[PDB]
Scaffold this motif. Structure first.
Motif, PDB file in Angstrom:
ATOM      1  N   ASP A  99       0.823  -1.200   0.000  1.00  0.00           N
ATOM      2  CA  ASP A  99       0.000   0.000   0.000  1.00  0.00           C
ATOM      3  C   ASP A  99       0.860   1.254   0.000  1.00  0.00           C
ATOM      4  N   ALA A 100       1.990   1.199   0.694  1.00  0.00           N
ATOM      5  CA  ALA A 100       2.893   2.345   0.724  1.00  0.00           C
ATOM      6  C   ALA A 100       3.414   2.611  -0.695  1.00  0.00           C
ATOM      7  N   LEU A 101       3.823   1.558  -1.398  1.00  0.00           N
ATOM      8  CA  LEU A 101       4.336   1.728  -2.756  1.00  0.00           C
ATOM      9  C   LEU A 101       3.267   2.168  -3.753  1.00  0.00           C
ATOM     10  N   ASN A 102       2.057   1.652  -3.601  1.00  0.00           N
ATOM     11  CA  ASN A 102       0.982   2.035  -4.505  1.00  0.00           C
ATOM     12  C   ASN A 102       0.587   3.497  -4.320  1.00  0.00           C
ATOM     13  N   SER A 103       0.594   3.975  -3.080  1.00  0.00           N
ATOM     14  CA  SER A 103       0.235   5.367  -2.835  1.00  0.00           C
ATOM     15  C   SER A 103       1.233   6.286  -3.538  1.00  0.00           C
ATOM     16  N   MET A 104       2.459   5.801  -3.712  1.00  0.00           N
ATOM     17  CA  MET A 104       3.523   6.571  -4.360  1.00  0.00           C
ATOM     18  C   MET A 104       3.388   6.674  -5.875  1.00  0.00           C
ATOM     19  N   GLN A 105       2.940   5.595  -6.508  1.00  0.00           N
ATOM     20  CA  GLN A 105       2.806   5.565  -7.964  1.00  0.00           C
ATOM     21  C   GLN A 105       2.053   6.736  -8.576  1.00  0.00           C
ATOM     22  N   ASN A 106       1.009   7.200  -7.904  1.00  0.00           N
ATOM     23  CA  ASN A 106       0.228   8.320  -8.410  1.00  0.00           C
ATOM     24  C   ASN A 106       1.142   9.545  -8.536  1.00  0.00           C
ATOM     25  N   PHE A 107       1.932   9.798  -7.502  1.00  0.00           N
ATOM     26  CA  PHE A 107       2.872  10.914  -7.503  1.00  0.00           C
ATOM     27  C   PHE A 107       3.923  10.696  -8.583  1.00  0.00           C
ATOM     28  N   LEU A 108       4.494   9.497  -8.603  1.00  0.00           N
ATOM     29  CA  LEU A 108       5.531   9.183  -9.575  1.00  0.00           C
ATOM     30  C   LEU A 108       5.076   9.410 -11.013  1.00  0.00           C
ATOM     31  N   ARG A 109       3.882   8.943 -11.352  1.00  0.00           N
ATOM     32  CA  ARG A 109       3.392   9.115 -12.714  1.00  0.00           C
ATOM     33  C   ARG A 109       3.157  10.580 -13.091  1.00  0.00           C
ATOM     34  N   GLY A 110       2.830  11.410 -12.106  1.00  0.00           N
ATOM     35  CA  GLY A 110       2.574  12.814 -12.387  1.00  0.00           C
ATOM     36  C   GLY A 110       3.783  13.733 -12.446  1.00  0.00           C
ATOM     37  N   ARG A 111       4.963  13.225 -12.102  1.00  0.00           N
ATOM     38  CA  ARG A 111       6.174  14.046 -12.115  1.00  0.00           C
ATOM     39  C   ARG A 111       6.569  14.486 -13.519  1.00  0.00           C
TER      40      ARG A 111
ATOM     41  N   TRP B  63      14.355  10.590 -15.528  1.00  0.00           N
ATOM     42  CA  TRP B  63      14.498   9.662 -14.415  1.00  0.00           C
ATOM     43  C   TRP B  63      15.346   8.443 -14.742  1.00  0.00           C
ATOM     44  N   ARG B  64      16.244   8.101 -13.826  1.00  0.00           N
ATOM     45  CA  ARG B  64      17.118   6.952 -14.014  1.00  0.00           C
ATOM     46  C   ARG B  64      16.323   5.658 -14.226  1.00  0.00           C
ATOM     47  N   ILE B  65      15.200   5.527 -13.528  1.00  0.00           N
ATOM     48  CA  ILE B  65      14.385   4.326 -13.641  1.00  0.00           C
ATOM     49  C   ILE B  65      12.891   4.597 -13.460  1.00  0.00           C
ATOM     50  N   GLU B  66      12.060   3.809 -14.141  1.00  0.00           N
ATOM     51  CA  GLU B  66      10.606   3.927 -14.003  1.00  0.00           C
ATOM     52  C   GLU B  66      10.267   2.819 -13.019  1.00  0.00           C
ATOM     53  N   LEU B  67      10.047   3.187 -11.763  1.00  0.00           N
ATOM     54  CA  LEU B  67       9.758   2.207 -10.727  1.00  0.00           C
ATOM     55  C   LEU B  67       8.541   1.324 -11.023  1.00  0.00           C
ATOM     56  N   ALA B  68       7.570   1.858 -11.758  1.00  0.00           N
ATOM     57  CA  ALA B  68       6.362   1.105 -12.088  1.00  0.00           C
ATOM     58  C   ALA B  68       6.659  -0.218 -12.792  1.00  0.00           C
ATOM     59  N   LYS B  69       7.781  -0.273 -13.503  1.00  0.00           N
ATOM     60  CA  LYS B  69       8.167  -1.480 -14.230  1.00  0.00           C
ATOM     61  C   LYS B  69       8.698  -2.592 -13.331  1.00  0.00           C
ATOM     62  N   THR B  70       8.883  -2.289 -12.052  1.00  0.00           N
ATOM     63  CA  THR B  70       9.401  -3.274 -11.113  1.00  0.00           C
ATOM     64  C   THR B  70       8.304  -3.889 -10.253  1.00  0.00           C
ATOM     65  N   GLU B  71       7.067  -3.461 -10.478  1.00  0.00           N
ATOM     66  CA  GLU B  71       5.941  -3.952  -9.695  1.00  0.00           C
ATOM     67  C   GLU B  71       5.843  -5.477  -9.628  1.00  0.00           C
ATOM     68  N   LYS B  72       6.217  -6.156 -10.711  1.00  0.00           N
ATOM     69  CA  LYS B  72       6.160  -7.616 -10.750  1.00  0.00           C
ATOM     70  C   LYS B  72       7.068  -8.251  -9.699  1.00  0.00           C
ATOM     71  N   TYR B  73       7.986  -7.466  -9.146  1.00  0.00           N
ATOM     72  CA  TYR B  73       8.919  -7.971  -8.137  1.00  0.00           C
ATOM     73  C   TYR B  73       8.581  -7.587  -6.695  1.00  0.00           C
ATOM     74  N   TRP B  74       7.618  -6.687  -6.510  1.00  0.00           N
ATOM     75  CA  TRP B  74       7.256  -6.245  -5.168  1.00  0.00           C
ATOM     76  C   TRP B  74       6.837  -7.371  -4.237  1.00  0.00           C
TER      77      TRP B  74
END
Length: 294
Positions: A151-163, A205-216
């Motif tokens: 849940d902590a990581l998902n709450s972040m994705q919204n912010f990350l996508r809007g940067r 950005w050095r990395i798109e964290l959203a692409k690592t979701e399969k590993y969470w």
């Protein structure tokens, strides 16, 4: 205010690109170092960050206890270059940490205390749990609680996508990181942001964290009990996370780990309040006689 970039050398005594020859070939891991005596604090950053996120913390802790620092850019982050950058499984990342320590010290490693934030905290536990670092004497997780990790990581994705998708300069990225509220501490932002971005092909950005979701799931599943089972003194620091999960609550009642509550921070408390984190770490180190106070 001054938002110009500050280099790693203002905080770390040296840096190295550690060569590692693994199953997929020959990789190189960036580490920033400091100190000559005392335990090595092996610092693992969070998703999308870099070892530079530990710059201000490093200066703060070094001034409190006699110790060494090795801040590592994990796979696909910062200046680290691996052959298979897509594989961010807990297994592979933990193996990387072990491989790096092996390459850096061979058969004579110094005492080491793992310290990790978020993704880095999970990797720290997987590393300790798999006994990949022989000289490990302690383990610390910052703001990592299995129960609410996803849940902590998902709450972040919204912010990350809007940067912003790109920045004209490094200075503008730093200014944005502060004014957006991502990094409250200007000092930390000036040095750490260079680790979060890279030149396009302007910065991006050095990395798109959203692409690592399969590993969470691999990072967090069973992490709390995994943490508790590690046969070394442990430290849990809470800042942005306001509660323990059921597993840790039970472990705490059993006295299996030290815990400390720091001021709230939605992102990285080690960047926002470097000395508060250093104070907590120093107290723990002294408590277990792992290091001498300065």
């Amino acid at each position: 205010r001054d938002f110009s970039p500050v280099p790693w050398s203002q905080y770390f005594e040296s840096m190295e690109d550690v060569e590692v020859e693994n199953e997929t070939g020959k990789d190189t891991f960036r580490v920033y170092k400091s100190g000559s005596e005392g335990p090595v604090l092996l610092l693992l950053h969070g998703g999308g960050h870099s070892a530079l996120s530990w710059a201000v913390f490093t200066a703060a802790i070094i001034s409190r206890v006699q110790c060494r620092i090795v801040a590592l850019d994990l796979r696909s982050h910062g200046e680290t270059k691996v052959k298979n950058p897509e594989d961010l499984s807990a297994e592979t990342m933990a193996k990387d940490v072990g491989n790096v320590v092996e390459a850096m010290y061979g058969d004579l490693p110094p005492p080491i205390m793992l310290i990790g934030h978020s993704m880095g905290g999970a990797i720290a536990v997987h590393t300790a749990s798999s006994n990949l670092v022989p000289s490990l004497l302690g383990l610390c997780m910052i703001d990592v609680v299995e129960g609410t990790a996803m849940d902590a990581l998902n709450s972040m994705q919204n912010f990350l996508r809007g940067r912003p998708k790109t920045f004209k300069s490094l200075e503008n990225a730093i200014e944005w990181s502060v004014k957006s509220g991502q990094i409250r501490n200007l000092e930390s932002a000036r040095v750490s942001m260079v680790g979060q971005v890279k030149q396009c092909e302007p910065y991006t950005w050095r990395i798109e964290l959203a692409k690592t979701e399969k590993y969470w799931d691999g990072w967090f599943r069973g992490l709390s009990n995994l943490f508790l089972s590690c046969p070394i003194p442990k430290l849990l620091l809470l800042a942005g996370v306001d509660r323990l999960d059921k597993d840790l609550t039970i472990g705490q009642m059993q006295g299996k780990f030290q815990m400390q509550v720091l001021p709230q921070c939605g992102h990285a408390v080690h960047e926002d309040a470097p000395d508060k984190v250093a104070e907590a770490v120093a107290t723990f180190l002294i408590r277990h006689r792992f290091a001498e106070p300065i």
